[PDB]
Amino acid sequence: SKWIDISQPLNNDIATWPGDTPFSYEVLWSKEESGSVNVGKLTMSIHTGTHIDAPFHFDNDGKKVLDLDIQVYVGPTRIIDVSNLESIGKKELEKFHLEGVERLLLRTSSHGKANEFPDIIPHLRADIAPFLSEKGIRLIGVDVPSVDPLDDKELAAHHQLFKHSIHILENVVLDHVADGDYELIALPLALSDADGSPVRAVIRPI
Amino acid sequence: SKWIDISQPLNNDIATWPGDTPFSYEVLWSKEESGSVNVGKLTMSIHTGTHIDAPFHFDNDGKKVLDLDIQVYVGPTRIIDVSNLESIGKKELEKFHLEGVERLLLRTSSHGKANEFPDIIPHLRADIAPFLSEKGIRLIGVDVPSVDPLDDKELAAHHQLFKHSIHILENVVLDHVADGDYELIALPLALSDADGSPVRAVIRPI
Ligand SMILES: [Mg+2]
Ligand SMILES: [Mg+2]
Ligand SMILES: [Zn+2]
Ligand SMILES: [Zn+2]
Ligand SMILES: [Zn+2]
Ligand SMILES: [Zn+2]
């Protein structure tokens, strides 16, 4: 079975958090100019497109990207539909059979426009974290830019998730994939000091 | 079996090519400033650390990163030792068992210092490409910054490899891994317009 891309295309039209570094890929020096190669430059916010958060993003004493365990970001994953819900917590996830699940992707289908930043999204409620952690879930992914409300300064979901050893993947693209079981790859770059990393998230049906 | 990291750590001390953008990770907004999060800004040449080249790097009409087939960058890989050789071509690879191999990583052990740019490296000779392609090899990886000599402006190996449908992975770290068969992951970011991408390359022993 083929790997399926669930990442947002990265280009100058992609949205960012309000005021954050705009995405920029540019050819600084062309093959015609250099006589051999197109020399590029990439400038971006960490939290652009499909990406993972490190605890340092919301906790000054939290792990940086390179400290994160790579095993978390590769392996069996379950994908479920949680569309048409203002927020997702224990109550909403109790209806799913999640025994033995290690990684969980949530399709909210709430936004899905990579080149616009949403005004509101469905967030995850804090009680989701003990619930998921008890099941053995080590990674949660969402198809929106955040696990907390866009205007929230407390970031209760970010904090509680990492308190329970649950890692965070944001802006996956899931409208073209069915619910069910897959193998996931969503590896951070080896960034020694960073608060997160863009990733190429892909999945393969089991 | 656990995944093993074969990527170079990315930080402000990493080496770059002569003439390339220096690597920069900075915290744009501190948690003190934003009131909630540390937000990072990443500026880099795509040919920094462990990365893949897109044909657009050396051919104006070549594919950009997002156009590359993701299947090439995930799957069975063989790792072999080609240390203490000034250059590697058909002659040097004939002695290896490579039947059915799809992806090949070459340990030159020539450099291995991510924070220094080498003065000389072992390059791949152009006759490597028809040889590897005939065996079905779709990806070649090296533990140095280039498949061509550092001062070479023609980039014969880059061109010939692509001419034979062989993709290119550079700056893997292989000094801590044994020869043999593994599963490789080395996925480019979903960069619409780029000449290459940093990757998180990891391997798992069969
Ligand atoms: Mg020229
Ligand atoms: Mg603390
Ligand atoms: Zn984020
Ligand atoms: Zn986040
Ligand atoms: Zn390169
Ligand atoms: Zn190259």
Author numbering:
A (entry chain C), B (entry chain D): 4 to 209
From the paper:
The proteins involved in tryptophan catabolism are in general highly conserved across species, but with the notable exception of the second enzyme in the pathway: kynurenine formamidase. This enzyme catalyses the conversion of N-formyl-L-kynurenine (NFK) into formate and L-kynurenine. Our attention was drawn to the prokaryotic KFase KynB (EC 3.5.1.9). The KynB subunit, approximate mass 23 kDa, comprises just over 200 residues with about 50% in 12 β-strands and 15% in four α-helices.
A structure was required without Cd2+ being present, or indeed any transition metal ions other than Zn2+ and for which we could obtain data to inform on substrate recognition. Highly ordered structures of BaKynB and a complex with 2-aminoacetophenone at resolutions of 1.9 and 2.3 Å resulted and confirmed the binuclear Zn2+ environment. The enzyme active site is a narrow cavity approximately 7 Å×12 Å and 10 Å in depth, lined by hydrophobic walls composed of Trp20, His60 and Leu158 from one subunit, and Val40 and Val42 from the partner. At the base of the cavity is a polar floor, where two Zn2+ ions, separated by a distance of 3.1 Å, are bound. One Zn2+ is co-ordinated by Asp56, His161, Glu173 and a water molecule/hydroxide ion in a tetrahedral fashion with distances less than 2.3 Å. The water/hydroxide co-ordinates with the other cation and acts as a bridge for the binuclear site. In a similar fashion, the other cation also has four ligands co-ordinating with distances less than 2.3 Å. These are His50, His54, Asp56 and the bridging water/hydroxide. Furthermore, unlike other metallohydrolases where conformational flexibility appears to be important, the catalytic site of KynB is relatively rigid with an average thermal parameter (B-factor) of 9.6 Å2 compared with an overall average of 15.1 Å2 in BaKynB.
